[PDB]
């Protein structure tokens, strides 16, 4: 009956971390594309 | 009710992992910038 406020924080903390990983994924996607372009220029 | 404390600790471990990944990623983003700029 206690610790239901705590579970709240956990679950929104997981939304926090997923949203951070999702943002990180977009930036990583961009660096991969950027490297591909740089590799194509040499070849 | 004892398992809550390993969840919170694991959330701290993941956050710390994602923060170290972000340093690495900022580093590679900056490196890419300098390679683009040498081309231009």
């Amino acid at each position: 009956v206690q610790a239901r406020q705590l579970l709240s924080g956990i679950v929104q903390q997981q939304n926090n971390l997923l949203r951070a990983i999702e943002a990180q994924q977009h930036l990583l996607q961009l660096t991969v594309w950027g490297i591909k372009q740089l590799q194509a220029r040499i070849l | 009710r004892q398992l809550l404390s390993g969840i919170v600790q694991q959330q701290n471990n993941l956050l710390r992992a994602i923060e170290a990944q972000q340093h690495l990623l900022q580093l590679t983003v900056w490196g890419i910038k300098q390679l683009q700029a040498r081309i231009l």
């Binding site: 705590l6 903390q13 990180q24 930036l27 961009l30 | 919170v8």
Partner: peptide
């Protein structure tokens, strides 16, 4: 993107602090 990631990380740092206080505030 970097600025967005920093804001989400900052948020998760505070929320992690809240949950650890909620976790210590789990006893008698």
């Amino acid at each position: 993107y970097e600025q967005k990631i920093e804001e989400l990380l900052k948020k998760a740092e505070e929320q992690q602090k809240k949950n650890e206080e909620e976790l210590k505030k789990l006893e008698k």
